[PDB]
Design an enzyme around this catalytic site. Structure first.
Site, PDB file in Angstrom:
ATOM      1  N   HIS A  78       0.859  -1.217   0.000  1.00 44.49           N
ATOM      2  CA  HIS A  78       0.000   0.000   0.000  1.00 44.49           C
ATOM      3  C   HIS A  78       0.881   1.249   0.000  1.00 44.49           C
ATOM      4  O   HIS A  78       0.629   2.166  -0.825  1.00 44.49           O
ATOM      5  CB  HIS A  78      -1.007  -0.026   1.148  1.00 44.49           C
ATOM      6  CG  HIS A  78      -1.862  -1.248   1.130  1.00 44.49           C
ATOM      7  ND1 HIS A  78      -2.734  -1.557   2.156  1.00 44.49           N
ATOM      8  CD2 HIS A  78      -1.969  -2.249   0.221  1.00 44.49           C
ATOM      9  CE1 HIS A  78      -3.355  -2.695   1.873  1.00 44.49           C
ATOM     10  NE2 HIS A  78      -2.911  -3.132   0.673  1.00 44.49           N
ATOM     11  N   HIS A 237      -8.830  -1.995  -5.627  1.00 46.73           N
ATOM     12  CA  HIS A 237      -7.819  -2.276  -4.580  1.00 46.73           C
ATOM     13  C   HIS A 237      -6.765  -3.252  -5.109  1.00 46.73           C
ATOM     14  O   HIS A 237      -5.560  -3.062  -4.774  1.00 46.73           O
ATOM     15  CB  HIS A 237      -8.409  -2.804  -3.275  1.00 46.73           C
ATOM     16  CG  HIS A 237      -7.317  -2.931  -2.272  1.00 46.73           C
ATOM     17  ND1 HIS A 237      -6.823  -1.835  -1.602  1.00 46.73           N
ATOM     18  CD2 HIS A 237      -6.529  -3.976  -1.942  1.00 46.73           C
ATOM     19  CE1 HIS A 237      -5.821  -2.223  -0.830  1.00 46.73           C
ATOM     20  NE2 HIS A 237      -5.620  -3.531  -1.028  1.00 46.73           N
ATOM     21  N   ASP A 241      -2.700  -2.696  -5.068  1.00 46.59           N
ATOM     22  CA  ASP A 241      -1.740  -3.773  -4.690  1.00 46.59           C
ATOM     23  C   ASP A 241      -0.724  -4.018  -5.811  1.00 46.59           C
ATOM     24  O   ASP A 241       0.492  -4.049  -5.529  1.00 46.59           O
ATOM     25  CB  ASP A 241      -2.458  -5.077  -4.360  1.00 46.59           C
ATOM     26  CG  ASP A 241      -3.056  -5.107  -2.965  1.00 46.59           C
ATOM     27  OD1 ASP A 241      -2.657  -4.274  -2.118  1.00 46.59           O
ATOM     28  OD2 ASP A 241      -3.904  -5.980  -2.730  1.00 46.59           O
ATOM     29  N   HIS A 264       0.055 -11.359  -4.644  1.00 44.68           N
ATOM     30  CA  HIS A 264       1.406 -10.826  -4.330  1.00 44.68           C
ATOM     31  C   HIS A 264       2.454 -11.767  -4.915  1.00 44.68           C
ATOM     32  O   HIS A 264       3.371 -11.274  -5.628  1.00 44.68           O
ATOM     33  CB  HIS A 264       1.550 -10.621  -2.824  1.00 44.68           C
ATOM     34  CG  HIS A 264       0.584  -9.623  -2.280  1.00 44.68           C
ATOM     35  ND1 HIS A 264       0.567  -8.302  -2.718  1.00 44.68           N
ATOM     36  CD2 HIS A 264      -0.415  -9.751  -1.375  1.00 44.68           C
ATOM     37  CE1 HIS A 264      -0.397  -7.659  -2.084  1.00 44.68           C
ATOM     38  NE2 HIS A 264      -1.008  -8.521  -1.246  1.00 44.68           N
TER      39      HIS A 264
HETATM   40  C1  LIG Z   1     -14.070 -10.220  11.539  1.00 44.24           C
HETATM   41  O1  LIG Z   1     -13.589 -10.947  10.409  1.00 44.24           O
HETATM   42  C2  LIG Z   1     -12.568 -10.499   9.594  1.00 44.24           C
HETATM   43  C3  LIG Z   1     -12.157 -11.315   8.560  1.00 44.24           C
HETATM   44  C4  LIG Z   1     -11.145 -10.920   7.714  1.00 44.24           C
HETATM   45  C5  LIG Z   1     -10.489  -9.710   7.920  1.00 44.24           C
HETATM   46  C6  LIG Z   1      -9.405  -9.313   6.983  1.00 44.24           C
HETATM   47  C7  LIG Z   1      -9.144  -8.064   6.390  1.00 44.24           C
HETATM   48  C8  LIG Z   1      -8.053  -8.236   5.550  1.00 44.24           C
HETATM   49  N1  LIG Z   1      -7.711  -9.510   5.628  1.00 44.24           N
HETATM   50  C9  LIG Z   1      -8.490 -10.220   6.485  1.00 44.24           C
HETATM   51  C10 LIG Z   1      -6.560  -9.766   4.756  1.00 44.24           C
HETATM   52  O2  LIG Z   1      -5.984 -10.909   4.615  1.00 44.24           O
HETATM   53  N2  LIG Z   1      -6.288  -8.576   4.192  1.00 44.24           N
HETATM   54  C11 LIG Z   1      -5.281  -8.241   3.179  1.00 44.24           C
HETATM   55  C12 LIG Z   1      -5.978  -8.522   1.834  1.00 44.24           C
HETATM   56  C13 LIG Z   1      -5.146  -8.557   0.529  1.00 44.24           C
HETATM   57  C14 LIG Z   1      -4.091  -9.651   0.675  1.00 44.24           C
HETATM   58  C15 LIG Z   1      -4.412  -7.245   0.355  1.00 44.24           C
HETATM   59  O3  LIG Z   1      -4.969  -6.155   0.210  1.00 44.24           O
HETATM   60  N3  LIG Z   1      -3.152  -7.295   0.370  1.00 44.24           N
HETATM   61  O4  LIG Z   1      -2.564  -6.049   0.215  1.00 44.24           O
HETATM   62  S1  LIG Z   1      -6.101  -8.865  -0.870  1.00 44.24           S
HETATM   63  C16 LIG Z   1      -7.451  -7.902  -0.846  1.00 44.24           C
HETATM   64  O5  LIG Z   1      -5.287  -8.571  -2.014  1.00 44.24           O
HETATM   65  O6  LIG Z   1      -6.541 -10.232  -0.951  1.00 44.24           O
HETATM   66  C17 LIG Z   1      -7.198  -7.474   4.606  1.00 44.24           C
HETATM   67  C18 LIG Z   1     -10.937  -8.857   8.997  1.00 44.24           C
HETATM   68  F1  LIG Z   1     -10.342  -7.685   9.198  1.00 44.24           F
HETATM   69  C19 LIG Z   1     -11.949  -9.280   9.804  1.00 44.24           C
HETATM   70 ZN   LIG Z   2      -3.820  -4.611  -0.478  1.00 46.24          ZN
END
Ligand SMILES: COc1ccc(-c2cc3n(c2)C(=O)N(CC[C@](C)(C(=O)NO)S(C)(=O)=O)C3)c(F)c1
Ligand SMILES: [Zn+2]
Length: 299
Positions: A78, A237, A241, A264
């Site tokens: 980010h 988003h 990334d 990633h």
């Molecule tokens: C209460 O339940 C919950 C369950 C799950 C979460 C939660 C929030 C996130 N999670 C898990 C997670 O792995 N993130 C990074 C996502 C990725 C890898 C990304 O942006 N990388 O840069 S992505 C969009 O590219 O796949 C954000 C939470 F906050 C609460």
């Molecule tokens: Zn991200």
């Protein structure tokens, strides 16, 4: 002449790691020409510096992690998204802990903090990495490609087997010589699903993760009371990334990125395959910005 940029002023933020849920102090400092972007673990004696480069990426599970020995700087995608968007060649990034703070889950806060401090043009040509040949990587249904293009442009497509996209495949595409990173992409938040709470629990992941820094989804419901920032937020988003992960090249791209469900991991694979196939790319500068195939916001 398109010139290298550093920060005009120092920038301080406080936040938590999405994955570690640790409190972290962040400082961005100017750096001189051809420094590139170097992360610094200042909570260690001696201080431990990991240049933000493709070779230093170590884990790519639910973030891009920089590793040097047993030492990581986690979730750089980010901040590096923000720093690529605004065109910063040279900066020291100081962290008091293992993970960049998530802020609100987007690059918004970073672009805002950076542009508040302002940028400093330095008296040296900016080096650009131009795609000369198609470069493609696949693993199962995930795919990531570089394609020659006189500009910089990022297409992305993903099918989530998830109720919340109400049936539809997410797709989007942005020409950054036509469109503002700041308005269209930077505000796109990261996201997660409650159907992954077990697995995430079993990997010691998303410990700082909440509605406060991420779009959270329970089946039919995004839990965030106030909803989304764009109709296509999730896929915008994934473009944010990709811009961050891509910037680990250490120079800006003249070319097109096409992502099909790529994460990633596959982003980083594409960098490596690209660096390796020197036929497919060359470094270029522009003595006259008036005939470059890209331009940048006033410093
Ligand atoms: C209460 O339940 C919950 C369950 C799950 C979460 C939660 C929030 C996130 N999670 C898990 C997670 O792995 N993130 C990074 C996502 C990725 C890898 C990304 O942006 N990388 O840069 S992505 C969009 O590219 O796949 C954000 C939470 F906050 C609460
Ligand atoms: Zn991200």
């Amino acid at each position: 002449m398109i010139k290298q940029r550093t920060l005009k002023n120092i920038i301080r933020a406080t936040g938590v790691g999405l994955h570690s849920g640790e409190k972290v102090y962040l400082t961005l400092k100017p750096a001189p020409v051809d420094t590139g972007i170097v992360f610094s673990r200042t909570d260690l004696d001696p201080v431990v510096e990991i240049p933000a480069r493709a070779e230093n990426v170590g884990e790519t599970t639910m973030s891009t992690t920089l590793v040097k020995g047993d030492v990581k700087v986690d979730t750089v995608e980010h901040l590096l998204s923000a720093m690529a968007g605004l065109g910063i060649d040279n900066a020291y990034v100081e962290l008091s802990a293992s993970e960049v703070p998530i802020m609100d889950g987007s690059a918004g806060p970073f672009v805002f903090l950076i542009q508040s401090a302002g940028l400093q043009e330095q008296e040296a040509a900016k080096k650009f990495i131009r795609i000369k040949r198609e470069v493609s990587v696949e693993e199962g249904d995930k795919r990531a490609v570089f394609v020659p293009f006189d500009g910089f442009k990022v297409s992305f497509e993903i099918d989530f087997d998830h109720p919340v996209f109400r049936g539809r495949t997410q797709q989007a595409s942005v020409d950054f010589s036509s469109t503002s990173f700041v308005k269209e992409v930077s505000r796109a938040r990261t996201f997660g699903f409650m159907r992954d709470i077990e697995y995430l629990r079993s990997q010691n992941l998303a410990l700082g993760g909440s509605v406060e820094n991420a779009i959270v989804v329970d089946e039919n419901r995004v839990l965030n009371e106030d909803g989304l920032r764009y109709e296509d937020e999730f896929v915008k988003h994934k473009i944010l990334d990709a811009i961050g992960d891509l910037y680990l090249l250490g120079n800006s791209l003249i070319g097109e990125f096409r992502g099909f469900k790529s994460g990633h991991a596959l982003n980083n694979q594409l960098l490596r395959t690209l660096i390796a196939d020197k036929d497919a790319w060359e470094v270029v500068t522009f003595e006259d910005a008036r005939t470059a195939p890209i331009s940048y916001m006033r410093p």
